[PDB]
Amino acid sequence: HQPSTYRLFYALRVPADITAPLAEAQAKLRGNWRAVRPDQMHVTLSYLPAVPPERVEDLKRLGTRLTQDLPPLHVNLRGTGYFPNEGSPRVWFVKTEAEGLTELAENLRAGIRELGIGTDDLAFKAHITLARKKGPAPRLPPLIFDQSWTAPGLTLYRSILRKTGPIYEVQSTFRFRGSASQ
């Protein structure tokens, strides 16, 4: 076997006042849909499937640098949708919007690539995944949300595989230390 690697991802944590109404929306799931646990809910910015542990310090430095001049981000829940766009849907998600969020994801992805570290991302579309399935299930009705929260930092997570699903461990957090007025 080859040197061990980590599955890592950068994400925004989702606070209790937001995971609670999202879980209430999950009560509508039926059939083969499998709900995401509130503790698993996050807004992913980049997924890194096989990071050599010696590269983690570079990733922590990248997180600090990119968050240093941004203020805490104001994230708004929007409407629900599915991936993939057409065909049997495999994931149900809620869209999220925040000023600066796409720019942060794109800078992060470029910074990871400049470090020569692998990613496994699709086009960035900020969301919180609510459910996953394989195979048929009743389609959920369209929902929209009006809640928002202030995100104080960006989190680097490690994913580890367990019987009940993946488990996420915080590797480091990077505080948004800037402002939008100075």
Side-chain angles (χ1 to χ4, degrees), residues 2-29 31-85 87-133 135-138 140-160 165-181:
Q2 309 292 315
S4 62
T5 54
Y6 293 162
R7 303 185 178 207
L8 304 179
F9 57 103
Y10 290 93
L12 307 182
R13 173 189 176 265
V14 178
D17 288 350
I18 304 294
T19 55
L22 292 176
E24 291 168 12
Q26 295 174 317
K28 306 162 187 300
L29 297 173
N32 285 341
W33 283 114
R34 293 165 283 144
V36 171
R37 291 182 319 253
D39 76 81
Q40 300 177 304
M41 293 174 177
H42 46 78
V43 182
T44 303
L45 285 75
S46 184
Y47 171 59
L48 300 72
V51 180
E54 53 267 34
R55 304 310 309 281
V56 172
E57 195 56 40
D58 287 342
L59 291 172
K60 287 173 54 179
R61 295 188 199 102
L62 175 64
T64 295
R65 193 185 96 245
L66 294 180
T67 53
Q68 193 66 17
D69 292 348
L70 286 168
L73 302 185
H74 188 243
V75 189
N76 300 290
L77 299 185
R78 301 295 290 174
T80 53
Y82 301 89
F83 181 86
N85 192 51
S88 196
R90 302 296 296 279
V91 351
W92 186 48
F93 59 80
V94 58
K95 177 172 173 289
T96 55
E97 182 272 335
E99 187 191 5
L101 181 58
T102 296
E103 144 186 10
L104 176 60
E106 295 302 341
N107 275 251
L108 183 66
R109 292 168 176 212
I112 297 163
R113 154 155 193 169
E114 289 160 15
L115 292 169
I117 297 167
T119 50
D120 178 35
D121 295 324
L122 298 176
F124 182 64
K125 307 284 173 42
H127 63 281
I128 299 164
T129 296
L130 302 175
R132 298 183 187 270
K133 72 171 172 72
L140 307 318
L143 304 177
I144 63 180
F145 297 84
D146 61 9
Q147 298 88 344
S148 64
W149 77 103
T150 296
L154 175 67
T155 298
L156 175 68
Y157 288 97
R158 181 182 168 187
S159 172
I160 55 112
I167 290 174
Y168 304 138
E169 293 176 3
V170 172
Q171 301 303 284
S172 193
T173 62
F174 318 106
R175 191 176 195 78
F176 296 122
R177 294 179 183 282
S179 72
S181 290

